Design a protein around this motif. Structure first.
Motif, PDB file in Angstrom:
ATOM      1  N   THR A   1      68.875  25.169   9.169  1.00  0.00           N
ATOM      2  CA  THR A   1      69.913  25.464   8.195  1.00  0.00           C
ATOM      3  C   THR A   1      71.061  24.463   8.144  1.00  0.00           C
ATOM      4  N   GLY A   2      71.882  24.306   9.165  1.00  0.00           N
ATOM      5  CA  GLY A   2      72.891  23.244   9.261  1.00  0.00           C
ATOM      6  C   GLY A   2      74.335  23.635   9.425  1.00  0.00           C
ATOM      7  N   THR A   3      74.704  24.284  10.508  1.00  0.00           N
ATOM      8  CA  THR A   3      76.064  24.706  10.855  1.00  0.00           C
ATOM      9  C   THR A   3      76.243  26.218  10.730  1.00  0.00           C
ATOM     10  N   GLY A   4      75.176  26.941  11.000  1.00  0.00           N
ATOM     11  CA  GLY A   4      75.147  28.407  10.906  1.00  0.00           C
ATOM     12  C   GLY A   4      74.445  29.014  12.113  1.00  0.00           C
ATOM     13  N   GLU A   5      73.166  29.307  11.947  1.00  0.00           N
ATOM     14  CA  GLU A   5      72.338  29.941  12.962  1.00  0.00           C
ATOM     15  C   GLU A   5      70.867  30.004  12.577  1.00  0.00           C
ATOM     16  N   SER A   6      70.127  29.064  13.140  1.00  0.00           N
ATOM     17  CA  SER A   6      68.703  28.921  12.904  1.00  0.00           C
ATOM     18  C   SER A   6      67.901  30.162  13.253  1.00  0.00           C
ATOM     19  N   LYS A   7      67.366  30.035  14.445  1.00  0.00           N
ATOM     20  CA  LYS A   7      66.505  31.030  15.103  1.00  0.00           C
ATOM     21  C   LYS A   7      67.332  31.589  16.265  1.00  0.00           C
ATOM     22  N   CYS A   8      68.560  31.128  16.208  1.00  0.00           N
ATOM     23  CA  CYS A   8      69.723  31.299  16.989  1.00  0.00           C
ATOM     24  C   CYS A   8      69.485  30.488  18.292  1.00  0.00           C
ATOM     25  N   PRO A   9      69.724  29.196  18.073  1.00  0.00           N
ATOM     26  CA  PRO A   9      69.505  28.204  19.101  1.00  0.00           C
ATOM     27  C   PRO A   9      70.536  28.217  20.204  1.00  0.00           C
ATOM     28  N   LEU A  10      71.719  28.753  19.948  1.00  0.00           N
ATOM     29  CA  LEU A  10      72.774  28.730  20.987  1.00  0.00           C
ATOM     30  C   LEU A  10      73.472  30.091  20.992  1.00  0.00           C
ATOM     31  N   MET A  11      73.288  30.835  22.059  1.00  0.00           N
ATOM     32  CA  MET A  11      73.969  32.160  22.154  1.00  0.00           C
ATOM     33  C   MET A  11      74.833  32.160  23.422  1.00  0.00           C
TER      34      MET A  11
ATOM     35  N   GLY B   1      62.516  18.257  22.517  1.00  0.00           N
ATOM     36  CA  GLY B   1      62.225  19.105  21.347  1.00  0.00           C
ATOM     37  C   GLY B   1      63.225  20.281  21.367  1.00  0.00           C
ATOM     38  N   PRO B   2      63.295  20.978  20.256  1.00  0.00           N
ATOM     39  CA  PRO B   2      64.183  22.117  20.079  1.00  0.00           C
ATOM     40  C   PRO B   2      63.850  23.270  21.016  1.00  0.00           C
TER      41      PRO B   2
ATOM     42  N   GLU C   1      78.940  39.053  23.052  1.00  0.00           N
ATOM     43  CA  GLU C   1      78.085  37.995  22.523  1.00  0.00           C
ATOM     44  C   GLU C   1      78.728  37.217  21.396  1.00  0.00           C
ATOM     45  N   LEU C   2      78.253  35.990  21.275  1.00  0.00           N
ATOM     46  CA  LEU C   2      78.677  35.047  20.273  1.00  0.00           C
ATOM     47  C   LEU C   2      77.401  34.408  19.712  1.00  0.00           C
ATOM     48  N   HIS C   3      77.086  34.727  18.470  1.00  0.00           N
ATOM     49  CA  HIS C   3      75.931  34.123  17.805  1.00  0.00           C
ATOM     50  C   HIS C   3      76.442  33.389  16.539  1.00  0.00           C
ATOM     51  N   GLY C   4      75.491  32.657  15.965  1.00  0.00           N
ATOM     52  CA  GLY C   4      75.791  31.962  14.701  1.00  0.00           C
ATOM     53  C   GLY C   4      76.595  30.726  14.891  1.00  0.00           C
ATOM     54  N   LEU C   5      76.748  30.171  16.083  1.00  0.00           N
ATOM     55  CA  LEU C   5      77.497  28.957  16.287  1.00  0.00           C
ATOM     56  C   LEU C   5      76.885  27.782  15.530  1.00  0.00           C
ATOM     57  N   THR C   6      75.571  27.711  15.469  1.00  0.00           N
ATOM     58  CA  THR C   6      74.938  26.503  14.877  1.00  0.00           C
ATOM     59  C   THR C   6      73.574  26.805  14.308  1.00  0.00           C
ATOM     60  N   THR C   7      72.900  25.812  13.773  1.00  0.00           N
ATOM     61  CA  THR C   7      71.524  26.012  13.280  1.00  0.00           C
ATOM     62  C   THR C   7      70.607  25.033  13.972  1.00  0.00           C
ATOM     63  N   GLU C   8      69.312  25.268  13.821  1.00  0.00           N
ATOM     64  CA  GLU C   8      68.347  24.341  14.477  1.00  0.00           C
ATOM     65  C   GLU C   8      68.578  22.929  13.946  1.00  0.00           C
ATOM     66  N   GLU C   9      68.814  22.846  12.641  1.00  0.00           N
ATOM     67  CA  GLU C   9      68.994  21.554  11.966  1.00  0.00           C
ATOM     68  C   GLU C   9      70.170  20.784  12.504  1.00  0.00           C
ATOM     69  N   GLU C  10      71.313  21.456  12.692  1.00  0.00           N
ATOM     70  CA  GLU C  10      72.498  20.792  13.189  1.00  0.00           C
ATOM     71  C   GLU C  10      72.516  20.472  14.698  1.00  0.00           C
ATOM     72  N   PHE C  11      71.798  21.230  15.450  1.00  0.00           N
ATOM     73  CA  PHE C  11      71.793  21.212  16.937  1.00  0.00           C
ATOM     74  C   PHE C  11      70.791  20.164  17.449  1.00  0.00           C
ATOM     75  N   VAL C  12      71.212  18.946  17.253  1.00  0.00           N
ATOM     76  CA  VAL C  12      70.338  17.793  17.617  1.00  0.00           C
ATOM     77  C   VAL C  12      70.450  17.563  19.117  1.00  0.00           C
ATOM     78  N   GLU C  13      69.604  16.679  19.601  1.00  0.00           N
ATOM     79  CA  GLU C  13      69.665  16.244  21.021  1.00  0.00           C
ATOM     80  C   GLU C  13      71.019  15.746  21.354  1.00  0.00           C
ATOM     81  N   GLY C  14      71.577  16.058  22.513  1.00  0.00           N
ATOM     82  CA  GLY C  14      72.896  15.551  22.926  1.00  0.00           C
ATOM     83  C   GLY C  14      73.380  16.281  24.180  1.00  0.00           C
ATOM     84  N   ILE C  15      74.586  15.935  24.560  1.00  0.00           N
ATOM     85  CA  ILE C  15      75.265  16.588  25.695  1.00  0.00           C
ATOM     86  C   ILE C  15      76.326  17.495  25.081  1.00  0.00           C
TER      87      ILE C  15
END
Lengths: 127, 127, 127, 127
Positions: free
Chosen positions: C3-13, C101-102, C54-68
């Protein structure tokens, strides 16, 4: 055992334990920083944990004034040496030192590849 | 709303996590006991954690009366099956439940070969 | 699916618990940063924990690229609002994400005034 | 500091910390049991933690033979004295002592009202 920039009465002591092996975490790099005027972290002291998983002599009472400090523990290097893939880049502990409260600070940290627990024991009169 | 040896509003949930692998602890045996009138531990419910590391349906609101319960987690079998010889025989959690009315209890436990942390989350029924 | 700055499959909780009250830690401020090309911390996402801690919806799979990434939890504000002067300024969790990979990441933190434990649960997308 | 049924070379040491106050947990009752032939727990040693939150002199090398041991910590009484309502009845640690592994056992436990973490440090050569 090694020290730091203050082998004297020990106001700050660091202890690191290994939860996988049930042992002291030896030869772990530790860097201490003091928050500076510009909101930057200034190198303050550093060392490697001894055979008992401890680090003393980081500083002296004279130098350890009130302010914000950061203790950084290189947990990633520790696990890599053991051939275990860890989650965290490092463990960071950030706290204020206040002249009011107790005077001796022990930062104790327990390590697992995907988890760490950190606690502070703050006490008076030597031990 | 009660039932009697199933799962009410899900009054007792157990969650187990693995700190070595950074995943749920799957197929962990859990045994629950209730302190009897004679001061002995009576079998209350048992099960194994799911793929999500959770165990639900142990009991119902109706069956889960006031008392002292013991949740026993078979951590030793869990580690041995992974090839690790752990320190503890098991993890046990002992608590008084429902002594001021019915509550929902979540017992969450994080496992390491030489360490474990256990916490309870207690909430006041209704959703 | 991204998606891109929302919440994919909820990659970060992020999940935060209170060990003093035996409940979720509600309305805890969380800030996430990503290490920039220049070695600086760039703002990535922020929010506050819900009634379930809980905190969901921080990001999406699309936005959450490889990084630190750095997850900063404002524990100090949390304790002060309860009337307790805590030891730490905040809890920070630093990790490399998605370098093979994601993946979906759950960062769970248990809070005490002088101690905190943090663990990660990492799973391989799909349900 | 007090002792137990063995102030000599110290094969078993207990340490208890308070995560709310960031201090040693003082005057906490500790009972140690050895699993007997009939699958019963036999009183083995006991004491109260000292000002540094420790308990030594519980036993001697001669008496500390291989077998299953239980360390019981009266956490409930500790919190009640502080006027804090706790979740657990007590904290229990159950482990096997093996002549094969390291010889000195330190059981360290960190207490919060709704949570505890316990770890074992097992070492050789005195410290």
């Amino acid at each position: 055992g090694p020290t730091g920039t203050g082998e004297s009465k020990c106001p700050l002591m660091v202890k690191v334990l290994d939860a996988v092996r049930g042992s002291p975490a030896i030869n772990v790099a530790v860097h201490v920083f003091r928050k500076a005027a510009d909101d930057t972290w200034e190198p303050f002291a550093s060392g490697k944990t001894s055979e008992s998983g401890e680090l003393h002599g980081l500083t002296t009472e004279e130098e350890f004034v009130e302010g914000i400090y950061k203790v950084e523990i290189d947990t990633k290097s520790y696990w890599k040496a053991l051939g275990i893939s860890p989650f965290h880049e490092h463990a960071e502990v950030v706290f204020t030192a206040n002249d009011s409260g107790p005077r001796r600070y022990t930062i104790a940290t327990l390590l697992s590849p995907y988890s760490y627990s950190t606690t502070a024991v703050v006490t008076n009169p030597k031990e």
